[model samples]
Target: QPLGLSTLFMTEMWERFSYYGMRAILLYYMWFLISTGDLHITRATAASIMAIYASMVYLSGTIGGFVADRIIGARPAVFWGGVLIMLGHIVLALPFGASALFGSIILIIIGTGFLKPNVSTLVGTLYDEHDRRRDAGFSIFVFGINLGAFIAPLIVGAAQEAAGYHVAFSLAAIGMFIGLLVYYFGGKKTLDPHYLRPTDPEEVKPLLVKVSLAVAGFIAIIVVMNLVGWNSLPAYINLLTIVAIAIPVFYTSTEHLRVVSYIPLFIAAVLFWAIEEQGSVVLATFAAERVDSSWFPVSWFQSLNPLFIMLYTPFFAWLWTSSPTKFAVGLMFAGLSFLLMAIPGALYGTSGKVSPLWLVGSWALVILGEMLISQMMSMWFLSSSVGSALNAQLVTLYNAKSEVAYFSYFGLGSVVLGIVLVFLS
Candidate 1:
């Protein structure tokens, strides 16, 4: 392990465990009523809610970075963020109502924003720019995330299997609590004062003031939306509203040519993540309702993506070190990953579940794709002449991944794009 890798590793490991555990059954919880949980809305509504929740999580990251750079410093931001995350899961543990659900969503999104970017930036801080292990280190750090993701679904959803939603959610809460403790106790020794660099400054007015306003603005928007009713707005409109707010408020990039040239790479990743992220929603639903997951729990299907990730991480950690054609290679694999899924839409006609083997196979292909692309994106972020926090924070946004209010825009796009591109190849 690198100097501080294990600290961040365990921290992120549990963090991913918390979030992905929640994800393991969030869609099912939302899609049904008595048997599963509340809101038991239609399939589409459930999916849209999940997408919106995801999009917000990613989008909050940039804002998190900004706040870290300006007000409390990265370390405190991470601590507080983890606190919020734990609180969010606790909210979900209650069977209060839709209000509890919305509250949980709000808390988690804000918490992720603070924790996600700062933690990634801190990982880079553990090594020198000249260190050969930088990319490898990143790959290893990601390995932690996948590892936690694998464990969460296998365990957390068992509560749902027996007692149902709130208890299942409590499992997620437990994970977050552990993550916060890990970071709190371990970070002090792992990260020294020397590693804590000067925070990013705005330089115009009070940087702290700007951050305060931005934070207030975000809360205000959430409040207004609550009053106006999110259900009343179209998912796209809601997403666009958030995007519109984000671009001007927190989009902080000092552009560079290499970063510009990487636009095509960005587009490819966006396309790739569109399909890859469906493991949380569409593919997950497929596992529960369609796929013959008799051998294991449906939530274990969620674990398969990360399980394969553990198997593949070491290979790609080494592979990315010297591969200049990584983007091309990664793009092809990601496309192929989805193309395998398109096969179900092919022979299975996209109607019913066929076989657990198909989902397993799809996960295998996609995990290979993730091995190529995910760490490759981390490498790309590292190479750019930008702040690590700022660069890494934009990752999900650049992927154009719709963990947004509008998913089909990209889900349909991913399936079609993957199929056509793979067909041509």
Candidate 2:
């Protein structure tokens, strides 16, 4: 047992705590009326912001990896990342309105980019390449992540409901601060000294050029969009839309056989993720507005994701099937989860508060899908962005009659896709 493992575990745990805690409350904060301590963004716009915000957080991790590998050591990156994250939460805690919100979003994006990937990399340094304990160590680290994710919403949600949204934001800041303290104090002597040095010192120079160009290009796009009278969020979404297409293009630009082999798997993963990721954006809104939350906090629903993963992971570890078959089955479950939601809306109407059990049952079904495909399919952000992008459109179209179709369309679409994949795969 490497002592550094404990430090890293606690550090990552607290970081997840802050991250999920902030995310759990962020949408509601955006949607709440100005009189009720929210920014009063339209529900549709708020959902878009949530989706985009989630998208960028995952996207930034790629850059974070480059910085750690080429410039600063992972240890320093981790520390700086936690600092930025804490500061981001602090900014949100302050009542500076929209500026503070946007500022904090940027800070958290950069911070999470720096923190998320590098910490996992640091854990790899703890063991020899063939070390038997490596897998166990990571499992423990993952357990810490899920545990942090599971706990935060309950605490933060309560605070938001009781004290206010900013106070809940303050709790997120404190979580990161505690994480930083853990890493600084517990990791100083325990972590290997090798992690203090960059792995690719020569790459640092090129990285600077590349980063500058990328930033400049992004700025240029923003300017061009502004000239066309596109608002900032729409411009950002348009840019992401380009990126969404570009990624798949890059991915499939390979041997024909290889691309062909990937097609079914890619489609399966995308469809499954589209349904699964909506848990936060679409399902969350349903939980708040439609579900009978008179008995429970709406934000607490966020914890169910990690909680379900934790409970079902061991069962999934024991389950096995062919890759394509597994994905098809997973997609079936994911599709069914949304399909289940449509029933409540259909029977009770969107205006009435339905049983919270509908949300719970939906979460349970999606977790089955997640368990099936999660190990086989991996991408940091593309699927997430795609799903949320879909959510943005669906959320905009969301209303009384459309709400039922919203769930039914995506749900039935995924289920049909899954069935097709089953035969094709």
Number of the top-ranking candidate, with lDDT as the measure = 2
lDDT per model, in order? 0.67, 0.82
Question: After superposing candidate 1, which stretches have Cα over 4 Å from the reference?
Answer: 1-3, 33-40, 129-139, 194-198, 202-237, 240-261, 317-325, 345-352, 374-425
Tens-place lDDT per residue, model 1, 143-213, is 88988988999888787887887888898898889888888888877775643443654465776587689
lDDT of 2 at 45: 72
Pairs that collide in candidate 2 are: none
Q: What 10-residue stretch in candidate 2 is worst by lDDT?
A: 374-383
lDDT of 2 by residue, 209-248 (tens): 9879978987898888889888666566768666654665
Off-target runs (Cα >4 Å) in candidate 2 are 33-40, 202-205, 251-255, 374-378
> How many residue pairs clash in all the candidates, one count each?
5, 0
lDDT of 2: 0.82
